[PDB]
Ligand binder design. Structure first.
Ligand code: LPN
Ligand code: NAG
Lengths: 171, 162
């Protein structure tokens, strides 16, 4: 199975469907866009006024600030381990969607897109694909959308129009 | 331009996605992550002591094996949370997909074991802007842009599941 693909100078329609929804950069110099909310279930729990979304192909995860993350995990019901967050494997599939407000759309990741489902047993812990990361100025403080996010949404980085483009990925 | 370059990736365990690039004449080949969060090309150097773990098990670039290499030597630094990364500037010919490009990059001569010893890949190619680039060295996609060979000044990512 193809592990991934990076196209220079275009996109590849075989790996997405639909057309792109595009967003302008806060500023040129960084692949960073505005985010208007983060939702748990169908309610807008976090980053209500607006926050920053760093779109990072070189990161494994979604990353929020400590403040943000405690609040997301609390809402999910997760236990904090030394370097990660975990839930009991049996309640991993019962986990609510997390939605991101980018441009004019909600970007919806499900339980299956953010939990490492290695077991289904009540006596096992399962890791989430979401960690804390404090980033410093001028780029930080920000969210960062790494591999977790890029798996579900195929991503075009457009330097001619300083904008980023999204489409639902095909597998 | 009229061409489209594309590069296959390896998905290691939904955490690491990397592909192949070549540096020099003849090409020495490396596994790298393409990073929009960063702006520099970094590979490990033959000057990296075998006593650095983060090096011993990765590939090393040897300038002494390349007929196209052009010396610079300016020292450059990057500060991670776990320690510091340093090395020196070099120039050589880099090939990504069908694209051959003259490029300045970093040769690392010291890096902490963690997290660097856990990468299946050898280095990084930054897809970010000059504003972020260390030493204000010109990023790879800017030089690709300047060649005039791309259909459009864009690039896209697909990452599979496991
Ligand atoms: C899909 O790829 C996700 C891989 C997650 C991952 C795993 C191991 C590592 Cl060490 C890293 C390290 N990385 C990151 O953390 C980046 C995340 N965005 C902002 C900039 C971060 C960055 C961190 C370190 C860095 O490195 C300086 C030197 O670069 C090297 C690295 Cl990163 C690794 C090796 C084996 C050799 C070299 Cl020469 C460059 C950039 C580099 C992008 C790889 C990331
Ligand atoms: C190496 O390149 C830099 C530009 O990034 C230049 O300013 C510097 O003088 C060069 N060093 C040498 C020794 O040629």
């Amino acid at each position: 199975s193809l592990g991934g693909q990076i196209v220079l100078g275009g996109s590849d329609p075989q790996h997405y469907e639909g057309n792109f929804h595009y967003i302008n950069l806060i500023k040129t110099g960084v692949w960073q866009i505005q985010m208007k909310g983060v939702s748990v279930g169908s309610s807008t729990l976090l980053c209500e006024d607006g926050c920053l979304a760093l779109v990072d192909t070189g990161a494994s995860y979604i990353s929020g600030s400590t403040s943000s993350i405690e609040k997301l995990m609390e809402a999910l019901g997760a236990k904090k381990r030394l370097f990660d967050y975990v839930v009991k494997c049996n309640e991993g599939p019962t986990l609510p969607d997390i939605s991101f407000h980018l441009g004019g759309k909600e970007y919806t990741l499900t339980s299956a897109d953010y939990v490492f489902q290695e077991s289904y047993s009540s006596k096992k812990l399962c890791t989430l694909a979401i960690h804390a990361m404090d980033i410093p100025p001028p780029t930080g403080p920000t969210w960062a959308l790494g591999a977790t996010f890029i798996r579900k949404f195929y991503t075009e980085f457009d330097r001619r129009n300083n904008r980023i483009g999204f489409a639902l990925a095909r597998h | 331009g009229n061409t489209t370059s594309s590069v296959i990736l390896t998905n290691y365990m939904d955490t690491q996605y990397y592909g192949e690039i070549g540096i020099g004449t003849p090409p020495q080949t490396f596994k790298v992550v393409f990073d929009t969060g960063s702006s520099n090309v970094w590979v490990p150097s033959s000057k990296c002591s075998r006593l650095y773990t983060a090096c011993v098990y990765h590939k090393l670039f040897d300038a002494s094996d390349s007929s196209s290499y052009k010396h610079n030597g300016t020292e450059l630094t990057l500060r991670y949370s776990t320690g510091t990364v340093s090395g020196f500037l070099s120039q050589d010919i880099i090939t990504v997909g069908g694209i051959t490009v003259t490029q300045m990059f970093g040769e690392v001569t010291e890096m902490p074991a963690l997290p660097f010893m856990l990468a299946e890949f050898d280095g990084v190619v930054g897809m970010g802007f000059i504003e972020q680039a260390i030493g204000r060295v010109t990023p790879i996609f800017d030089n690709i842009i300047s060649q005039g060979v791309l259909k459009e000044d864009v690039f896209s990512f697909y990452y599979n599941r496991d």
